[PDB]
Write a protein that binds this ligand. Sequence first.
Ligand SMILES: CC(=O)N[C@H]1[C@@H](Oc2ccc([N+](=O)[O-])cc2)O[C@H](CO)[C@H](O)[C@@H]1O[C@@H]1O[C@H](CO)[C@H](O)[C@H](O)[C@H]1O
Ligand SMILES: CC(=O)N[C@H]1[C@@H](Oc2ccc([N+](=O)[O-])cc2)O[C@H](CO)[C@H](O)[C@@H]1O[C@@H]1O[C@H](CO)[C@H](O)[C@H](O)[C@H]1O
Lengths: 159, 159
Amino acid sequence: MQGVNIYNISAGTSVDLAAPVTTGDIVTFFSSALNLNAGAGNPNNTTLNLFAENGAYLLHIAFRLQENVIIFNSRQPDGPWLVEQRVSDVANQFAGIDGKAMVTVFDHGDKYQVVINEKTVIQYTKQISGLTSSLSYNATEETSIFSTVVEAVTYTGLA
Amino acid sequence: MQGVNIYNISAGTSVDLAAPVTTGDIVTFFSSALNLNAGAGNPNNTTLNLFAENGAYLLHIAFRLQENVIIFNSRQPDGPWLVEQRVSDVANQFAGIDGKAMVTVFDHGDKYQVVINEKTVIQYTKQISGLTSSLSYNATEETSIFSTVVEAVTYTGLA
Ligand SMILES: CC(=O)N[C@H]1[C@@H](Oc2ccc([N+](=O)[O-])cc2)O[C@H](CO)[C@H](O)[C@@H]1O[C@@H]1O[C@H](CO)[C@H](O)[C@H](O)[C@H]1O
Ligand SMILES: CC(=O)N[C@H]1[C@@H](Oc2ccc([N+](=O)[O-])cc2)O[C@H](CO)[C@H](O)[C@@H]1O[C@@H]1O[C@H](CO)[C@H](O)[C@H](O)[C@H]1O
């Protein structure tokens, strides 16, 4: 059965999905703000994460203004960060829409397709496989590029 | 190639899709407001529509607060309106989210699954088949239950 689930994620918190995200599923994060003037992160300004049930970072999306890049990586719950994939020119990815943004992740089985607004920024070859059972939005109340609360909407049971 | 498209639909207007919505695709209408104290409709307070290339209403979603029902119907290019399907208790369908709302439509080929926020309100067996090439949001300032502008996000090329 296809379903839609909605979550309010406050900066620095995580949520367990009522409906896990697997191959064929979609998750979109909505921000009611776009603060490209957030300044230096620590080192990240904002991160959006998809976690496996074992706590592994299946997909880690990090916006780092001080380096003008968007980083994509994975990490076992007990291992070190793996190989980073980077997309340069942050402002460029959000161009066209001001004061807000949306980041969509399509779980394609072997890859995660990440779209910022209407622009696909990367076809991320997975470094770790599995279903996503938790999501998180991490940032400080001072240096995040997104609103204090980010809304996550999942479309599951699609396949 | 899976894609995300965003449209800003002002009340009383329609938009042509850059990427048509077909079987397996999804469209979600986002309202930045939810006025359940709107004046009586005549008879509709708000309607959301998916049109075929020929102008047929593939799916017509009409909210009627005063009558306390949501109407689902289809209309042939030159009319007439077809068989209406109704769902009672409008307020209850939006229960869970205050001051805003989302209506999602899944095109399952033989049916359209409509979900208000997280609740599926109907599995509408199509009366008219075909590709969705445009969308519309109709309402006026005093009768609408939604915001002046409704944002529509389409997820296509999913199948
Ligand atoms: C502070 C900082 O920019 N950290 C970067 C940096 O980390 C290292 C680690 C070790 C050494 N070294 O022994 O010489 C140099 C730099 O580069 C890393 C990539 O090579 C990371 O970018 C790291 O930041 C961390 O990135 C991960 C995701 O990959 C995650 O975002 C962490 O929160 C972040 O600290
Ligand atoms: C005004 C109104 O309530 N229109 C309804 C109604 O149509 C009639 C027809 C005759 C009379 N009357 O002689 O007193 C009153 C109401 O019921 C129709 C269904 O039997 C429709 O629901 C009609 O509204 C129209 O519905 C279609 C979708 O089916 C669409 O929403 C039109 O915009 C709407 O006017």
